[PDB]
Amino acid sequence: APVLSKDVADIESILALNPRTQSHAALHSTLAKKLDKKHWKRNPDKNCFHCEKLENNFDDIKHTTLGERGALREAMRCLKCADAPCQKSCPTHLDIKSFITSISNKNYYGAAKMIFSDNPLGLTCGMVCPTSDLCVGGCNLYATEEGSINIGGLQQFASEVFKAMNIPQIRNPCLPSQEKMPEAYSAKIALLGAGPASISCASFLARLGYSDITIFEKQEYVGGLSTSEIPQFRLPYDVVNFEIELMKDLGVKIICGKSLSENEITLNTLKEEGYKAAFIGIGLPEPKTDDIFQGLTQDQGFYTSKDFLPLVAKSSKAGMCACHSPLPSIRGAVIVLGAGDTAFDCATSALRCGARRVFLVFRKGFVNIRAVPEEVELAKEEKCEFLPFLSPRKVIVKGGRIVAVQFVRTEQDETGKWNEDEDQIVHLKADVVISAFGSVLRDPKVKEALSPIKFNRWDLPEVDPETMQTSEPWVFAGGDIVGMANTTVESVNDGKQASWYIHKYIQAQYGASVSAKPELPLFYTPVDLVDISVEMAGLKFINPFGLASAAPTTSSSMIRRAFEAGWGFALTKTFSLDKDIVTNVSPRIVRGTTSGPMYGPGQSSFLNIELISEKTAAYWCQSVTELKADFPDNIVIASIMCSYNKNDWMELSRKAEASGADALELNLSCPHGMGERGMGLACGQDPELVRNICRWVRQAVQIPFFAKLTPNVTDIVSIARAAKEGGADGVTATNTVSGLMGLKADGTPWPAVGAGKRTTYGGVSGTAIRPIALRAVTTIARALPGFPILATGGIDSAESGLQFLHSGASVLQVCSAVQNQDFTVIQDYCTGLKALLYLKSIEELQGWDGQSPGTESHQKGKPVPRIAELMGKKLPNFGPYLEQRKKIIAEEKMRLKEQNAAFPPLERKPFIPKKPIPAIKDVIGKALQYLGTFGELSNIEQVVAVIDEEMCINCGKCYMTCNDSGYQAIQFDPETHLPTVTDTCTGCTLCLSVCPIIDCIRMVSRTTPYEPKRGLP
Amino acid sequence: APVLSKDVADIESILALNPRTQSHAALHSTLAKKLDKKHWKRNPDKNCFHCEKLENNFDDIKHTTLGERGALREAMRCLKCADAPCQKSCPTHLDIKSFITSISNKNYYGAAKMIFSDNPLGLTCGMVCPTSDLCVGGCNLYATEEGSINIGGLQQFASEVFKAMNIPQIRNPCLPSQEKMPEAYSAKIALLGAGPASISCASFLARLGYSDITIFEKQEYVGGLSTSEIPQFRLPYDVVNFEIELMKDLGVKIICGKSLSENEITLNTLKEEGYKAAFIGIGLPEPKTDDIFQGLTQDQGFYTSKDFLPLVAKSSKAGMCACHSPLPSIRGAVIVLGAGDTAFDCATSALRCGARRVFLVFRKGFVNIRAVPEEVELAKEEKCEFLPFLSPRKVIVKGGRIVAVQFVRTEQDETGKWNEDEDQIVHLKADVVISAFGSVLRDPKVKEALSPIKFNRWDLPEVDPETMQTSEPWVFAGGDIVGMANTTVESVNDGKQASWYIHKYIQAQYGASVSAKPELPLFYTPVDLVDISVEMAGLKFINPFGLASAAPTTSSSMIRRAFEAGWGFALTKTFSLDKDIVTNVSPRIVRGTTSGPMYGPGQSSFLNIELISEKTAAYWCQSVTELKADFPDNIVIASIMCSYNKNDWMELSRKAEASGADALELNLSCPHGMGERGMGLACGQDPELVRNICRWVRQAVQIPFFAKLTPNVTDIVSIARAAKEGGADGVTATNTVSGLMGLKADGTPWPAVGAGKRTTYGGVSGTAIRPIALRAVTTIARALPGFPILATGGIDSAESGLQFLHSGASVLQVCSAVQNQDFTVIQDYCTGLKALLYLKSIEELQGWDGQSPGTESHQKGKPVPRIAELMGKKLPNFGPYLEQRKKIIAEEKMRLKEQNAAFPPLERKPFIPKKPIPAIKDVIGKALQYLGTFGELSNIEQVVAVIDEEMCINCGKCYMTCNDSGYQAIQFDPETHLPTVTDTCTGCTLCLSVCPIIDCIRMVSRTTPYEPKRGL
């Protein structure tokens, strides 16, 4: 019979590309290499000077866009810094540390809530903020080779998920009922212009309780420049609509077709009409012009950015207008004049209109470009040509058309000044000219409508930079109109700033005072109303999260701050009688090596050789009395430990109870009387000793007490049962896992103590032991139904916490997650749990896994075009294949231009719960139904792996894993590097487990014949 | 008595910047924000158009340079792809997957060996390769938001560590002795030009065994352009010297002051002198010139790149020449003509010479720039101005000096045919002009010296692109001179390619044939000679690494491939008697959630609910016979399992022994009993059962057998002892840890089987259980001294393997690391272990931790200036402080300039072992001496944390950890964001444990009185 230990021809063939170490250096000529290189090319080719067709292509071109896989990686990378410089560098002071922490914990709702609390246009800003000159410019990670965090992309991601949840914004909960609001809040308020500034101002005023807010917008569309000029390929119109609807949820009214102008709305007519306050947020409505372009028409080929961008927007943004607008026909060479964002967006937009070539002409040098590198990069990658040091002089017009523009040289002298060299000219051929010099306010009728407010030397409304108030106390202004900044986030901040002082002004007008300290409300939704309280062992917890007896509870002052932060409960560090006083050694707590040489945030574990508290029982008991007196609703559990002695346990437990502790937690780590039978060395490892100790405490106190169990036992259920039989009211599962974190190359340990560099076995904590704790909790919950369990072991998010609740635990203890961060994580845990419970009531989101939307086919986090001429073509994203994909996509865009259609918009409508929102008590133990013996698992219902070609990044890991750890069932194409799972798959699932792309590989029910490989008959 | 649970004023103050969730939105005016922004600025300011002083500043400006912290992070990120496109895109075909895998496993030696095996100028290339147009351009991770891997930087890092090791290259080991080499290998070989091409060619010929190789170099310095023109701030000269010395270790001779030219050395004089083969690697020695610059002199301010760059290099590269020379005095505005690497290096170099302003003028557009984007980036960040579409027409000279250059406008038309517009001119003011159009071969005397080889239409030596052979069979050529490529790596490849055919030619001349298949040797050093064999339980292992009984040993055909790859031993997947046949379910193996939502390479654990082998005992026994017959030196251990039955264990053990297995491994996972006698349900959890099973097997077979222990017990020592008492020859520690990996938000498990979505407890494997396995191994080793232990549990590198050996294990079993990669990791483990053992004999490297050099103060992996005017200044790397640091550094550079001195690179000298290189038997159990009870630990010898301000990146994590998990002992400055550990520190070590910068925080002996805090 055949050589069993040898691969047959077929398998040898399938293993052709499997890694094998070479015994010699490789020989490939330089010429051969030059040729082969093209086949695998991923990035832009430096030698290719021809741009990829972009006519009618408005697909997202942002390099910062992130999908869930990418967002989680970047969020975990963030150091989540104290007094973070990125936040200091953000105009709206977003708590970046907190929102990124939430994203890293998969709590997208909490992240979005944090974002929108300080920036009502959070999604728009995540997408368009020039971060390199703002938040990212101050990021501490810039000091590392890998670089600064993609803050904008993370903000965009969390906000997009929230948008997908279709949850509405709600009125401030702690606010009195609409009917009980003081009359001052009904004051008629008017805002002019529906752009970022007014949207923000109106939003914050509405949060404060004002019920009569109206925004008067000149145009038929809303959103300001975010709608009329920023390209669809950078800022999708549906984003703007989303943020507007959120504002409308607060009652803000918007009336379009109304202009602030002398023969229409004026400050005088508003005051006559009874308006108490007004906010001017009309931006800079007119284009900066140059005398040389006077008289030129669009038919001749001349446009100002104010003419051009809105035309492209109306045509590419579904919804914006009621009438379908044609895409401007831009053919030939295009000259764009300007060096700011306007110019770059005109250049890129011109390509979508069919431009053959685009020239960006600056009057200064490259170094003087105004737009941030990120913006410049977009025009650069699309092959726009940059021409520096040129100033326009004349537009040659022949046959009623622009045929060229004549320029003159410019240069900086010996002081810095700029001059024009007349004898040095340039005759640049062009068919279209677009001036993108900027914008201004110059309509006399508009300025007159603002009488009698004072205008500064820049001929713009003068305002106090702190209050945003004009010379007229009831009139405020912000955004581009003030002329201080030119970004969406700064305009949003102006409205935010103004809202507080408008509030102060109105209240004063009604004879009411306001807090000296500004107090703008946060952002709220129905999720915030979800009840996450839970009752266990007769105790009421405001929320299920608490601090475990550990380093974070080293001092009672820390517990105090934890309760102030919002933690539901806390354990004191374990303490004992005076005679059992201990002294710690140092070093004693080290990082885990459980996930490789990854330093900084998110350590996968810690190992400690710390003893019980070094502080006295007297200190802890007085501390408990103090804590319970000041925080009656927060549960305080005293952790205590004694040697195996009845009088001692009774004495200490009674002392703790007398201090006012809500309950006790018995630390069973103390060694016994003389080893002997293999029940370890600690009392907690022997059922008999545990039972006795619990009996002693039960007899001594009347308050509930829980036995903290060690996972270092053969059968933890035996110990849990012993504690129950002893009288314990529940058990804490579990303590740390015994281990050695590692040795240095010289053999010395870490931690290493004293001159002798000695160590002893320590306790492992963190996410690395979560599988062990989860097993412990579930096994105890199944063996002792209804017996209270306090879970501990790797809990670092609402999601992981919910896993333990589902496993049978009632409350959740945390240590390592706090050591990795700080007490503020409680805010993430609470909003996260509320969101998870809330989402369970939304029928239309059942396909989601918690807060994670179903994974859709993507590449780099961008939706893969579902084009018939692409699905099933085996065209990977590299080399000649990518060229083909681009050609196909370009053809589709042209077809879409032909086959016209565009008005099936989405009347945004919030999802409404269709079943009661589950309370904590309703989810406890729900996972137990799926757990059982191996025999209870079906060996008939087998699965096989299936790969989504469109999501694949061609690494071949699935292939390598099946080859050297599986069944050699995957074919890896030598040309496309695309994997195909064959019929020999056994569904072991290893490939799916090593794939870098989330959900690229999925396990599906086997449809073909199934037979175990016995290797022989 | 005070309120004990409240922070006193002092502590409230220290906690000032500690994170606290806000209950309201913040109010900060736009004006206030604009002002505050500058204080924290890290990156370049878009509105600042003035460049940082760079006169005489040759500090490394590469954005790709990596320090160990950064290199480990990037290496772990690499997907380590199959048939990798990056390698396909590398001109020298470097096995990137393997060298990066080695870096990820901290095996820098293995990584360097891999790099140099295919590229003898590996360090130079890591630093200068235009990767985006090469290897990186084909990287699969470009398909992710985070982007492609920094391959060049990783190559640079590994090569730099190897350089620091001061290990010499040695002659290929498996080559006959010098004396026994055929006469053909003594053939006189000549190479012209000591640049990358010839260095590579000479190196490979030397590896093949040729003993008379001489490189004739025209100049007094060696290295070619790497030395004469590439700037010191991109390629340090010591790198070039390092690679040249490695080549010289192979016997290659270099003679300077010798030129290929008529009247000097010619192909005819060489042939006449007895040379059998010649390689031409003289590059393109002359500058491409323009008629309009004829007659202009350096005194007037005109230079060609060939004049200028070497002048700067000779002045900034210590060791290049022997004469100390001043830097060229470049003052005023500088005009650099060109759009390739040459032009950009001239521009950046001009700034070091004192240039006030630099203009890069291109004949074409910005889109037509020849240099890759990172090269262009360097000039751009230093504020060089780019002027496109200009062609030089005249140079204006007044008072003996250039004052301006007049250009005419250029433009492309319908036929790409670039035209020049005469009526459109530019009068650009300038004091210095540097032409950087490129290079060529124009010396008639040099071309004559190459007679009679054929020259092509480009007037360059014509060569066959595959063999590198010229029209004369004994003459070959490569590098810039062939005119096909313009990169160091391609020039290196040309020499590599040529070496094989030169070898083929010479051998044929001596009447000898060569293999049809090219066989260039790998790179070797003394480390490769280190013996890593080990004997255990009477068995000899060629190396201590083996495959555990698991998924990687699902089929014997897989074990065969593992042995072919080099694995020392392997366990069969556990098998049993026919009556105990099992059937697996699916899904059954899932990724661990032990390190968060991190997917792809390096999963920290796996959970499986797989059963024993589904293949029959008949299959496994025949397979063992086949494997042992084909691989007699590779150890094969048969893993078997039976229910608690004497006859069964004896029958199966004898069946396995009869098949020829070297030993047996008893899988004790089979259930027995009810389940509350406090010893679980598996036989392996009960000492009595284990002792009886071992007794049965010992009585049945003569070969050694080991009991595989489960870590899921209260006292694993009791089980180990029971196995020993039963007759086992050792124990395998340990099997998987029982657990539940997690649940989805809806409560369903993963793995989930059937429509019922059911699951059962599985076994956790991988790095996440290493602490448990290491504890188990150490405990058994201390309780049962000398009892053989086969370790298993998270072993994924030579370094982790050595930890287990130090802990008492003799051999190392692996599963998860292979599931995370493939069988080739064995190559990394073996070279890594050899290196770790070798380094223990090097006295001058005692300060290193294994292969990791002692950590030096750095920022972004670059050395921090050990300047007096900088130390203790509390100047962080941001805002106005950074501005300050730049001013101080610039002043230091100017000071160093005035003191025209220094030059002692103290010739490179290999370190020599000063003690015997440890064998595996010499390190086993060495760490046990440090293990003991808690009471044996000194509570008198306490430590405190100390922070190196220069390495800090100001995140405040140390501060937050001490505040909410410590003793509130760190002050975090509100302006500089610099932390300071105060006297209240207790040395808990949490801050050091969460700091993102390796070795920024260190624990040092406490010098002040220690008093435990008692709460009062």
Ligand code: SF4
């Ligand atoms: S954790 Fe480390 S890099 Fe961060 S502020 Fe503390 S010493 Fe600096």
